Design a protein around this motif. Sequence first.
Motif, PDB file in Angstrom:
ATOM      1  N   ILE A  49      -4.076  24.286  24.032  1.00 43.11           N
ATOM      2  CA  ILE A  49      -3.581  24.295  25.392  1.00 43.11           C
ATOM      3  C   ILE A  49      -3.679  25.710  25.995  1.00 43.11           C
ATOM      4  O   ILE A  49      -4.145  25.867  27.121  1.00 43.11           O
ATOM      5  N   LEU A  50      -3.247  26.726  25.242  1.00 43.47           N
ATOM      6  CA  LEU A  50      -3.262  28.126  25.700  1.00 43.47           C
ATOM      7  C   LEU A  50      -4.670  28.713  25.858  1.00 43.47           C
ATOM      8  O   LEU A  50      -4.909  29.558  26.729  1.00 43.47           O
ATOM      9  N   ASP A  51      -5.580  28.301  24.982  1.00 45.49           N
ATOM     10  CA  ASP A  51      -6.975  28.729  25.044  1.00 45.49           C
ATOM     11  C   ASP A  51      -7.563  27.863  26.165  1.00 45.49           C
ATOM     12  O   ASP A  51      -8.192  26.831  25.927  1.00 45.49           O
ATOM     13  N   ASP A  55     -12.971  28.146  24.286  1.00 46.52           N
ATOM     14  CA  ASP A  55     -14.014  28.863  23.565  1.00 46.52           C
ATOM     15  C   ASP A  55     -13.558  29.325  22.180  1.00 46.52           C
ATOM     16  O   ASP A  55     -14.333  29.940  21.442  1.00 46.52           O
ATOM     17  N   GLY A  56     -12.301  29.031  21.831  1.00 51.05           N
ATOM     18  CA  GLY A  56     -11.768  29.418  20.533  1.00 51.05           C
ATOM     19  C   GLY A  56     -10.896  30.672  20.508  1.00 51.05           C
ATOM     20  O   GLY A  56     -10.345  31.032  19.466  1.00 51.05           O
ATOM     21  N   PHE A  57     -10.780  31.364  21.638  1.00 46.65           N
ATOM     22  CA  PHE A  57      -9.952  32.566  21.674  1.00 46.65           C
ATOM     23  C   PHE A  57      -9.100  32.607  22.928  1.00 46.65           C
ATOM     24  O   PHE A  57      -9.538  32.184  23.993  1.00 46.65           O
ATOM     25  N   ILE A  58      -7.893  33.143  22.796  1.00 48.22           N
ATOM     26  CA  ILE A  58      -7.049  33.324  23.949  1.00 48.22           C
ATOM     27  C   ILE A  58      -7.387  34.763  24.342  1.00 48.22           C
ATOM     28  O   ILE A  58      -7.092  35.695  23.586  1.00 48.22           O
ATOM     29  N   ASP A  59      -8.059  34.954  25.476  1.00 48.22           N
ATOM     30  CA  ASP A  59      -8.361  36.314  25.887  1.00 48.22           C
ATOM     31  C   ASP A  59      -7.185  36.822  26.710  1.00 48.22           C
ATOM     32  O   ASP A  59      -6.203  36.101  26.893  1.00 48.22           O
ATOM     33  N   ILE A  66       0.199  32.497  29.541  1.00 50.80           N
ATOM     34  CA  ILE A  66       0.843  31.791  28.427  1.00 50.80           C
ATOM     35  C   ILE A  66       2.064  30.955  28.806  1.00 50.80           C
ATOM     36  O   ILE A  66       2.152  29.788  28.414  1.00 50.80           O
ATOM     37  N   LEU A  67       2.997  31.521  29.569  1.00 44.82           N
ATOM     38  CA  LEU A  67       4.202  30.777  29.953  1.00 44.82           C
ATOM     39  C   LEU A  67       3.861  29.490  30.708  1.00 44.82           C
ATOM     40  O   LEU A  67       4.478  28.445  30.473  1.00 44.82           O
ATOM     41  N   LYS A  68       2.878  29.561  31.606  1.00 42.04           N
ATOM     42  CA  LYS A  68       2.457  28.395  32.373  1.00 42.04           C
ATOM     43  C   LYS A  68       1.897  27.330  31.438  1.00 42.04           C
ATOM     44  O   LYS A  68       1.839  26.148  31.795  1.00 42.04           O
ATOM     45  N   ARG A  75       6.041  31.986  35.568  1.00 43.87           N
ATOM     46  CA  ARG A  75       5.378  33.171  36.090  1.00 43.87           C
ATOM     47  C   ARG A  75       4.267  33.597  35.149  1.00 43.87           C
ATOM     48  O   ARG A  75       4.160  33.109  34.021  1.00 43.87           O
ATOM     49  N   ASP A  76       3.423  34.501  35.631  1.00 40.69           N
ATOM     50  CA  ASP A  76       2.368  35.062  34.809  1.00 40.69           C
ATOM     51  C   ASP A  76       3.027  36.275  34.170  1.00 40.69           C
ATOM     52  O   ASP A  76       3.982  36.840  34.718  1.00 40.69           O
TER      53      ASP A  76
END
Length: 109
Positions: A49-51, A55-59, A66-68, A75-76
Amino acid sequence: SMTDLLSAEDIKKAIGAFTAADSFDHKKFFQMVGLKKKSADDVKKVFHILDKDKDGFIDEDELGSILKGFSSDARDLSAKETKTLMAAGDKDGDGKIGVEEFSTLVAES
Ligand SMILES: [Ca+2]
Ligand SMILES: [Ca+2]
């Protein structure tokens, strides 16, 4: 949706604890939202969900959102929070967070 993995009760409480800019505490957040007691497979589903682009990475840009990922109206993260969190989760040195790094970060206490 995230509530298919975590309770809405825990999400609202976790998100509710970090509504101010520069308040994010990842150890506290993961514990409050309840993913510390989830299986390694469920943690991976949270990672998907976060990625955002898969593509396999959370940049860093995905990390700021992340919070969203847990609650849509959240918030961001501030630029400072994003940089600090990336430093915390990126332990293999490529500037982003992969699934194994994510499980290690969540497992912290
Ligand atoms: Ca990505
Ligand atoms: Ca990394």
